[PDB]
Amino acid sequence: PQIKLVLLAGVGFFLDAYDLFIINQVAPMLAQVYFPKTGLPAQRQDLMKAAANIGCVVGQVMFGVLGDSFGRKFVYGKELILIIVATIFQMSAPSHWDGNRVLTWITICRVFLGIGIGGDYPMSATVVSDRANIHRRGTLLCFIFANQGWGSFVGSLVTIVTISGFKHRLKSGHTHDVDKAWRILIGLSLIPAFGTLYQRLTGVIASKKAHWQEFVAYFSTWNHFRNLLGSMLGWFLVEIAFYGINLNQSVVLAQIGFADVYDKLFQLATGNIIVTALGFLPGYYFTLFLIDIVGRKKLQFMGFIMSGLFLAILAGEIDHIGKGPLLACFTFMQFFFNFGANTTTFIVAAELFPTRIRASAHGISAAAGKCGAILSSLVFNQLKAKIGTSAVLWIFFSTCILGFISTFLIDETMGVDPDEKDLEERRAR
Numbered sequence: 001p002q003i004k005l006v007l008l009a010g011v012g013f014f015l016d017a018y019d020l021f022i023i024n025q026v027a028p029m030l031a032q033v034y035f036p037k038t039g040l041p042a043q044r045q046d047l048m049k050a051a052a053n054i055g056c057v058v059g060q061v062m063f064g065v066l067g068d069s070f071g072r073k074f075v076y077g078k079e080l081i082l083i084i085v086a087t088i089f090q091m092s093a094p095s096h097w098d099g100n101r102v103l104t105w106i107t108i109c110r111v112f113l114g115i116g117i118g119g120d121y122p123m124s125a126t127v128v129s130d131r132a133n134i135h136r137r138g139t140l141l142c143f144i145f146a147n148q149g150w151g152s153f154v155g156s157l158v159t160i161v162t163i164s165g166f167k168h169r170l171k172s173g174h175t176h177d178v179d180k181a182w183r184i185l186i187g188l189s190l191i192p193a194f195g196t197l198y199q200r201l202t203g204v205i206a207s208k209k210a211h212w213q214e215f216v217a218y219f220s221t222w223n224h225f226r227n228l229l230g231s232m233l234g235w236f237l238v239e240i241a242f243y244g245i246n247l248n249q250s251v252v253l254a255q256i257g258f259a260d261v262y263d264k265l266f267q268l269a270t271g272n273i274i275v276t277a278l279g280f281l282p283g284y285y286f287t288l289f290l291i292d293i294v295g296r297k298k299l300q301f302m303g304f305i306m307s308g309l310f311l312a313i314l315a316g317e318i319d320h321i322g323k324g325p326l327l328a329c330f331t332f333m334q335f336f337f338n339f340g341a342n343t344t345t346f347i348v349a350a351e352l353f354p355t356r357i358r359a360s361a362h363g364i365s366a367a368a369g370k371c372g373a374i375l376s377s378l379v380f381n382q383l384k385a386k387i388g389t390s391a392v393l394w395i396f397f398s399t400c401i402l403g404f405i406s407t408f409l410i411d412e413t414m415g416v417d418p419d420e421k422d423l424e425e426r427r428a429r
Contacts, residue, residue, distance in 0.1 A: 303340010
């Protein structure tokens with residue numbers, strides 16, 4: 001039946017989101033081993049966490065050109081072996097290496113990982129927006145997207161289960177074993193990755209120029225232009241805050257009160273699991289249960305404006321008030337990222353556009369998102385040192401208000417067939 005396919009994409013999303021966000025759980029493990037007396041250098045950490053997103057855009061452009069050049073049959077398996085191989089290369093960095101060299105190893109692998117994650121990334125959105133042609137398409141997209149929570153959560157659960165498995169060995173003085181853990185965090189993606197590898201297996205310029213002509217004609221009209229503009233902005237703007245935060249959720253929880261060797265790692269994994277269990281994850285399900293009742297915009301407004309509120313509260317109060325209030329707001333924000341703009345910018349970018357031009361607009365929006373993702377991903381930790389976390393949160397707040405303001409450019413997509421609207425638009429003229 002139709003069911004088995006959407007699960008596989010979810011597991012693909014889970015693996016990407018796992019692979020994407022597991023870096024959030026992996027980065028602190030790298031610090032304790034290779035940089036115990038100081039922290040991970042800012043530019044290298046940004047590049048590493050953006051690396052998957054940078055490779056994610058190069059992946060979706062390269063696996064876009066090859067996918068367009070030689071069809072779907074050419075790209076489907078090769079991306080997963082690429083993230084498996086990139087996972088395996090990433091998973092098996094030499095242990096006797098200098099810290100800076102290990103990081104650069106992982107980034108490049110995470111680019112290729114991102115290139116592989118960049119393959120299947122927009123390709124898991126299209127397959128079910130085309131298929132349904134029914135009012136209940138949004139619940140389905142968010143369900144697969146919610147695996148972004150499970151990827152972040154299971155990565156979070158794997159982390160506490162991993163760390164609590166190494167409990168006694170660490171307390172007895174064998175402090176280097178944490179290096180085994182982060183490979184396990186990444187490597188455990190191989191279980192579904194090979195599981196998925198098993199399951200996945202078990203006139204070129206003339207057309208490109210003609211498609212470019214229709215695309216230019218369509219998005220040269222205001223009521224059509226603004227929707228791509230708002231989609232790019234909303235996705236661009238939220239992925240600034242969303243991946244700024246979710247690739248660095250562990251960094252934010254370290255300014256909040258969650259920061260011996262085991263005690264530290266387990267507490268951070270507890271804050272991560274709390275936030276992702278209580279906020280990041282259920283926010284997808286509050287979105288899941290309300291998109292087809294409340295609408296994408298009001299949730300994006302709320303998501304932007306409330307995550308903006310909580311970003312404004314975080315920005316305003318982070319250096320002045322206690323852990324609990326912040327953790328709630330951060331969980332409220334994470335809740336209102338996924339119960340809001342992070343989820344809706346993914347959905348709205350998929351739903352706005354008639355089929356005849358959808359592929360470019362979503363790729364440009366996702367690229368814009370990855371641009372916003374890589375922008376914050378590329379610079380989140382550098383800005384944190386140059387201007388402070390509160391200032392960045394105000395930026396995320398402003399991007400939420402700009403996300404809020406830019407959200408006005410968008411049409412509501414609940415219950416609308418974009419193809420019948422295009423046909424009636426023309427039969428009227």
